[PDB]
Amino acid sequence: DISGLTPCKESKQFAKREKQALKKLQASLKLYADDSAPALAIKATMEKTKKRFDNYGKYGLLCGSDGLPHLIVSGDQRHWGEFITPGILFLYIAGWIGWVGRSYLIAIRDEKKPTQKEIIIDVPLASRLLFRGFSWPVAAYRELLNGELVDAAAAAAAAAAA
Amino acid sequence: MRDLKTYLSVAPVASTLWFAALAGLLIEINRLFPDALTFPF
Amino acid sequence: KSQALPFLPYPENLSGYVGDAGFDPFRFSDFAPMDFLREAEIKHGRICMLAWLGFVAVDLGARIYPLPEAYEGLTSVTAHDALVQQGAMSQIFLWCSVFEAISTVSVIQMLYEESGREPGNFGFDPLGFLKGKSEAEVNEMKLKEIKNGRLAMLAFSGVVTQAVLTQGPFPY
Amino acid sequence: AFEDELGAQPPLGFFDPLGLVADGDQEKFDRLRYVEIKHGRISMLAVVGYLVQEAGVRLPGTIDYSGKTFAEIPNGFAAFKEIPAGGLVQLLFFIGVLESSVMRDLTGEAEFVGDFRNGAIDFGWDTFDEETQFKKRAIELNQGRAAQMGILALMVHEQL
Amino acid sequence: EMSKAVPFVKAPANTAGYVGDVGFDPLGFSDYFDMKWLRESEIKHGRASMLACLGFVVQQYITIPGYTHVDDSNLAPQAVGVSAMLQIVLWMGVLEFWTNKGNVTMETMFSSPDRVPGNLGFDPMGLSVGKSQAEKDEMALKEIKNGRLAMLAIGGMIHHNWVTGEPL
Numbered sequence A: 001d002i003s004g005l006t007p008c009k010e011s012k013q014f015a016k017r018e019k020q021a022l023k024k025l026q027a028s029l030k031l032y033a034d035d036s037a038p039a040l041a042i043k044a045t046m047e048k049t050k051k052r053f054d055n056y057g058k059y060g061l062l063c064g065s066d067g068l069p070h071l072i073v074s075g076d077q078r079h080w081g082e083f084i085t086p087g088i089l090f091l092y093i094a095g096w097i098g099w100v101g102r103s104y105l106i107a108i109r110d111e112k113k114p115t116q117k118e119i120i121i122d123v124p125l126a127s128r129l130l131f132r133g134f135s136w137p138v139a140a141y142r143e144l145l146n147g148e149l150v151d152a153a154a155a156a157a158a159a160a161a162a
Numbered sequence B: 001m002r003d004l005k006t007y008l009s010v011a012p013v014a015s016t017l018w019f020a021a022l023a024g025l026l027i028e029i030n031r032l033f034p035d036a037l038t039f040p041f
Numbered sequence C: 001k002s003q004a005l006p007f008l009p010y011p012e013n014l015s016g017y018v019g020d021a022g023f024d025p026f027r028f029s030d031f032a033p034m035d036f037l038r039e040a041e042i043k044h045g046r047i048c049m050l051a052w053l054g055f056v057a058v059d060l061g062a063r064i065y066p067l068p069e070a071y072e073g074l075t076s077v078t079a080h081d082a083l084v085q086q087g088a089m090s091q092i093f094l095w096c097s098v099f100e101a102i103s104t105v106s107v108i109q110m111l112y113e114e115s116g117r118e119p120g121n122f123g124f125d126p127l128g129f130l131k132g133k134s135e136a137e138v139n140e141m142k143l144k145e146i147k148n149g150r151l152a153m154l155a156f157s158g159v160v161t162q163a164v165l166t167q168g169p170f171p172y
Numbered sequence D: 001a002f003e004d005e006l007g008a009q010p011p012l013g014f015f016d017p018l019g020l021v022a023d024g025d026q027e028k029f030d031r032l033r034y035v036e037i038k039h040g041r042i043s044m045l046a047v048v049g050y051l052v053q054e055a056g057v058r059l060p061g062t063i064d065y066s067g068k069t070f071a072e073i074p075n076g077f078a079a080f081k082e083i084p085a086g087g088l089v090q091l092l093f094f095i096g097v098l099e100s101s102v103m104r105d106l107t108g109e110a111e112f113v114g115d116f117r118n119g120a121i122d123f124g125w126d127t128f129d130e131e132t133q134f135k136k137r138a139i140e141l142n143q144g145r146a147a148q149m150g151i152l153a154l155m156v157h158e159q160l
Numbered sequence E: 001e002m003s004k005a006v007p008f009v010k011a012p013a014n015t016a017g018y019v020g021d022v023g024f025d026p027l028g029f030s031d032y033f034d035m036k037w038l039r040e041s042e043i044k045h046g047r048a049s050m051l052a053c054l055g056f057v058v059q060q061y062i063t064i065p066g067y068t069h070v071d072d073s074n075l076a077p078q079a080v081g082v083s084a085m086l087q088i089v090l091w092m093g094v095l096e097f098w099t100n101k102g103n104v105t106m107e108t109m110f111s112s113p114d115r116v117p118g119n120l121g122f123d124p125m126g127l128s129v130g131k132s133q134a135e136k137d138e139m140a141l142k143e144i145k146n147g148r149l150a151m152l153a154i155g156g157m158i159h160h161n162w163v164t165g166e167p168l
């Protein structure tokens, strides 16, 4: 496949990693009696470990000669779950914070003491604003084609140079 | 107790409560849906 | 000047309360607000009145009829540890804590910012025992409540001690 | 003070040794009487129950579809624990609809019980004699007052 | 002065002209947030619950042709997939933008002097049209109460199955 990689369910070296990770925890398990808390903890760890290899095998990830999963970010839609889909997710949450935080500064600006409300949050007002950023791509778009997103060039102070 | 409420609204107290709620958010999701390298789950 | 301890001065804060007696040698009344201290003694008494009788009915022999199978062959000393393994004590803790989060709102509104609510009155009189009563009868009932509340705090305190020492029949 | 009320019959008259309607409140008598009349007849149906049951008179047939018959049922407190689990539910249900339907008759404490023609049967309050009801309601209370001591016998003369 | 519902904390201010008013706000949310938003929330939470209480029960016995009968309502999304689920919620969105003429946030909603809480304009049959005020207040008390019963209900129906593994 891409870059001469093989899928992880068919990699001979990915399977060896699964065995040696389980063998290491089994040889630690043998020094304890079967009902005790260290034996139940290591038994639960080998279940977590065994479920970690099974998950990847059917995942659809690509392995190398090293036996480790690789990620593809060319833009292929077949490997979307690797970068695109968690990427769109992060953009939604990061742009949500920046939008909401900016709404707050603009709101408390027209006031006697704007600086007072940055060290001591008006929580009822802040709480209201935080959840209005769920539709930010629409709200950031309405202000771009209004004139309320970016200011004019005669409103920004500039260094003597330019 | 309107002065304790203004004390609970100061920036470092709100930052630790917000982070405590948000670290524990990520810890809980990693407790039920662990080892999620990608969407494959 | 104290009626309980006639070789002491009067503690200068206990005035106006239903139970007076001049009894405060360690003087907590000059330290804590005196509405808040009466809250406790009412709440401490009301738990112990239910805790004494409730701790005994189960040892004189009286159990609930449906019997979940988890409440089988248990005395009251053992009935704490097996129950928290069941979920009964995790529940009663929940519905008590629901009532206590409301009571936290009430006690801060009374001590500070002036609710006007009495230390231990929750408006709970369904059968109307005090309605229509004058101040000579309301002050008597409230007085009777603390006395039995005071008696049951010391009564329950011994019997959980008495039961773990001599593990047996209800009389210990 | 609180005389010439319902059911103060003389073999005694004014049965108050310890001040219980006076030191109750203004009105607990209005609770207490509603409270007493219900206790009297649950005892009556307990006494008329536990006696007619003890004579062996049973309903002919089965109590469920799985073949449990009424004649397989002895008495005492050993008969409530025998009628099956679902069979106890439908007992308690259209009883529990009717402490709801009778306590809430637009007045709680003025009128007494909320008479037995609440469901399936219909009552007339208009035919209402002043003299006739004083004796008949005071028989009825005092039948139950003896029946409570009578059922307290046969509940306690089982354990000893 | 004191609350009608719980008579040992102070009566909540700025909840007076509302339908299910019994003065129940011990945590004081109506002191901090706009009351029109809170009412509109409570009605909407109630209407979605009342539809989900019918749904959870009727889905066991009726199933439309083409789908797979699932013993427990809770396991239904797995038996319908994700594409069908997203179609539902994205159309719910489109039904919600048209609903409030585009004013969908806690700052844009209730910006008109009209637009009272819960009035959708929805009335195809004509229930409560041209009647008096007392009757209108009475029918609005029924929608709140049945919606509040259904919220605590739809918990229990969903929760019962969480522990156990079989239908209602």
Ligand code: CLA
Pocket: C046, C047, C049, C050, C057, C120, C121, C122, C123, C124, C125, C129, C130, C141, C142, C143, C144, C145, C148, C149
């Ligand atoms: C002997 C104890 C006693 C006394 C004198 C009072 C007295 C009072 N309480 Mg109080 N209370 C008690 C115990 C008591 N309480 C307990 C244990 C609790 C916890 C559940 C409470 C919780 C409580 C609340 C939450 C409130 C009161 C209030 C009041 C006042 C008005 C109501 C009233 O008079 O009813 C009391 C009248 C009685 C005749 C007492 C009842 C005696 C019982 C029935 C004895 C029987 C014991 C047991 C149930 C028997 C069962 C059988 C057994 C074999 C299993 C009054 C000053 C209200 C208040 O302060 O308003 C002014 C109020 O808001 N109480």
Ligand code: CLA
Pocket: A093, A096, A097, A100, A129, A130, A131, A134, B018, B022, E089
């Ligand atoms: C460390 C990593 C990290 C992560 C993962 C997050 C994650 C999040 N932050 Mg945080 N944050 C962080 C660090 C982080 N933060 C840091 C370092 C800071 C600086 C101090 C902040 C500052 C901060 C602020 C101020 C805020 C956040 C908020 C948010 C949330 C925005 C998305 C959301 O609310 O849910 C996603 C919600 C949805 C997708 C809902 C969709 C819209 C609805 C209408 C659709 C309804 C669908 C329906 C219910 C489905 C049911 C249908 C049924 C049939 C199934 C999100 C949980 C915001 C928040 O908490 O929200 C109130 C917020 O205000 N963050």
Ligand code: CLA
Pocket: C047, C050, C051, C052, C053, C054, C055, C057, C058, C062, C063, C064, C071, C074, C075, C076, C079, C080, C083, C088
């Ligand atoms: C401090 C109070 C208190 C506490 C923490 C407990 C705790 C416990 N009881 Mg107990 N109990 C109490 C008082 C208390 N009881 C009282 C006062 C009685 C006599 C009525 C009983 C009678 C009793 C029985 C018969 C049984 C228990 C049992 C138990 C255990 C399981 C819970 C249960 O089934 O409750 C059952 C509780 C009750 C039937 C009574 C609760 C009454 C509450 C506490 C007071 C009423 C509150 C109300 C506001 C007052 C006004 C109402 C008015 C109409 C009377 C648990 C350890 C069970 C067990 O496992 O035993 C081994 C059991 O079978 N209890």
Ligand code: CLA
Pocket: C090, E159, E161, E162, E163
């Ligand atoms: C806020 C209300 C609320 C409440 C009370 C519950 C309650 C519950 N949900 Mg639930 N749920 C809710 C909201 C809620 N949910 C919401 C909004 C959603 C999303 C829509 C879900 C989704 C959800 C799902 C999908 C499922 C549940 C399940 C459950 C049950 C699991 C119980 C549990 O967590 O063990 C509580 C844990 C304990 C009691 C253990 C504690 C034991 C130790 C000894 C106590 C000491 C440790 C202590 C906690 C530490 C102290 C803290 C520290 C600060 C000091 C329980 C009935 C599931 C279920 O029933 O499975 C079993 C199930 O299928 N719910």
Ligand SMILES: CCCCCCCCCCCCCCCC(=O)OC[C@H](COP(=O)(O)OC[C@@H](O)CO)OC(=O)CCCCCCCCCCCCCCC
Pocket: A088, A091, A092, A137, A138, A142, E094, E097, E098, E101, E102, E103, E104, E108
């Ligand atoms: C398949 C579904 C698509 C059908 C579209 C349905 C149209 C909705 C109806 C429009 C409202 C008309 C009513 C009055 C018309 C009106 O004036 O209201 C327009 C409305 C805002 O209206 P207002 O300006 O009155 O709202 C208050 C503003 O002044 C803000 O203060 O904005 C929209 O129309 C948004 C439409 C949805 C846009 C959907 C595009 C999807 C973008 C999402 C991007 C995802 C990013 C993912 C993260 C990276």
